[PDB]
Write a protein that binds this DNA or RNA. Structure first.
Lengths: 136, 138
DNA sequence: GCAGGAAGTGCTTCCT
DNA sequence: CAGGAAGCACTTCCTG
C-alpha cells in the first residue's frame, strides 16, 4: 500500500457526493432542464440521502422512506415552495406510459426504474448497491 | 479594524458577481425554474457581459449587441446546444402579452423590461446604470 | 428580423 | 394515491 493506491482508493468517492449528479446527466443527455427521475437518481446515488430514500436491494427498485422530505428537496430544487409528495407523485404517474419508472404494486411509496439505465450510465444496480452499501 | 472588519474588507469582493443572479431572483420569488427574462436580467447586472448585452441608458430598455453569444450562453444554461437567438427571440415574443418585456419599435435587438422590476428588485434603473457605469446611446 | 400561430415538452395545478 | 384536463415557460418550426 502506497500513496498511489491511497489516492486511487479515495478516488472512488468516500468524499461527500452523489454518484450520478442530476445536472451532469442532463448535460451528458442534453435533455435540457432537470427532470424528476434525474433528480431522484442523484438522490439514490448520494449516501447522504439514504435516510429518506434508497434502494430496496432488488435491481432498479427503490423506496421513499420519507416522501415529505424528498418532495421538499425536489420543490426546493425547482424553486417550488408549494411542492409536496402529492404533486411530485403526479409527476411520476406520467412516467408509467413513457416507460421511465413504474410502481411496485402492493407496496406504498415503492417504485422501480424500468428504462435502460445500465447502458446509459454504464453501471449495474449491484455496482451501485455495493458503492452505496445497500442493506437488503 | 477587528475581525468582522477584516472579513467584510476581503468579502466586500465579487468583481465577477452579477448584481441580480437569476437563480437568487428565482429563489426570492419562487418562480420555479430559471426563466429567460430573469436570465437576461442577470447578464445585464454582470459587468462582464456588457460586451454582448447592455443597457441603452433609457429606463429598463436594453440591447443584444451580440445575440448569438447571448443565445449560446442561455442555451448552455438550460442544456440546449441547439439554442440560438432565432428560438430565443421566440421566447421573448411571448412576454409581449405577459407584459414582461417589450421590443423597442424601430430598432434591432432592442427590448425593454416593462414589468415592475423596480418594486421587485428594490433598485431603480438609474441606480443600476451607475453600479454598472453605463453609457447612454444615441 | 421580427410578429405570431401551432404542436410538443414536462412537470405543476386543480379538481372530480 | 388516482387520473383527466389545464397551465405555464419555453423550445422548434414555419409563414409573411
Amino acid at each position: 500500500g502506497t500513496f498511489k493506491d491511497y489516492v486511487r482508493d479515495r478516488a472512488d468517492l468516500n468524499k461527500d457526493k452523489p454518484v450520478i449528479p442530476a445536472a451532469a446527466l442532463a448535460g451528458y443527455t442534453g435533455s435540457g432542464p432537470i427532470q424528476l427521475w434525474q433528480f431522484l437518481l442523484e438522490l439514490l446515488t448520494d449516501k447522504s440521502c439514504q435516510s429518506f430514500i434508497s434502494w430496496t436491494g432488488d435491481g432498479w427498485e427503490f423506496k421513499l422512506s420519507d416522501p415529505d422530505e424528498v418532495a421538499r428537496r425536489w420543490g426546493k430544487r425547482k424553486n417550488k415552495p408549494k411542492m409536496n409528495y402529492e404533486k411530485l407523485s403526479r409527476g411520476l404517474r406520467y412516467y408509467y406510459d413513457k416507460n421511465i419508472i413504474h410502481k411496485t404494486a402492493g407496496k406504498r411509496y415503492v417504485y422501480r426504474f424500468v428504462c435502460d439505465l445500465q447502458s446509459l450510465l454504464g453501471y449495474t444496480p449491484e455496482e451501485l448497491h455495493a458503492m452505496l452499501d445497500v442493506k437488503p
